Amino acid sequence: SRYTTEFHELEKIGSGEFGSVFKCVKRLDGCIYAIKRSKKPLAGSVDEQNALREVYAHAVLGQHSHVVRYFSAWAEDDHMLIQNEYCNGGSLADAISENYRIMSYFKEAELKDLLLQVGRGLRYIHSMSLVHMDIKPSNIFISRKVMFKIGDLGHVTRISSPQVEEGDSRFLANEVLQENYTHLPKADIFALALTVVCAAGAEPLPRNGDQWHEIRQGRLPRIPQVLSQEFTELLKVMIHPDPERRPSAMALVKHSVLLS
């Protein structure tokens, strides 16, 4: 077994229908990696194309400071294995939950830093003619003095000829629901805005219904933080009903409210 041979398993750090994720030490180099171990999906299935999307996303992307680095992927024992960078801070979702527990919070500055960093990740992905299509707190990872990195590339697809597996409904732009895939990068932008709103301590986002539609009308969820009207206005245009009115990733990262 390659997994057993090359790595020592330390701790399970995730589980779901996707399988399990393990913090592991690679014996050769002594470095820590996050390894996902999944049952190999049925051929030609939803699970397979999603798994495929991730490998071939990696084939294109290479390496960037705001994308979780991919090292290797292989299959054995009717299981799939994906070896990624280990981010010692967990996901943004984990951080948000912990914030709520010990009633801490991300400062307004920290929200802007989060927005800029993931924005840089998106600009790179978009520059490679790809879109993430599943941006949300649980897919943003934290290293350490803090670095935010985009992970979980299972929904990544091409801007040109996309195979769109829709992401979490809570973060999904209406035009994607409407099967309008002519501006998918702006769907990532929509999702990032709501991701920041979650980090800002907004109540849980709706899966559907009235509240759901209200958001897609360009109405921000309620936010207990005292945020500047300017930063607030930036988050609002990011969820504008017209995706062409939303800023591109590159327009986002060179925005005044964010800089520096």
Ligand SMILES: C=CCn1c(=O)c2cnc(Nc3ccc(N4CCN(C)CC4)c(Cl)c3)nc2n1-c1cccc(C(C)(C)O)n1
């Ligand atoms: C390889 C799989 C994707 N993935 C990374 O690339 C990846 C890179 N780094 C981390 N770091 C990290 C994840 C989780 C905690 N904790 C432990 C203690 N608590 C249980 C809270 C969470 C800590 Cl400390 C570090 N995780 C990563 N991944 C990861 C992990 C779990 C679930 C998922 C899913 C649901 C598939 O998205 N992914």
Ligand SMILES: [Cl-]
């Ligand atoms: Cl676009």
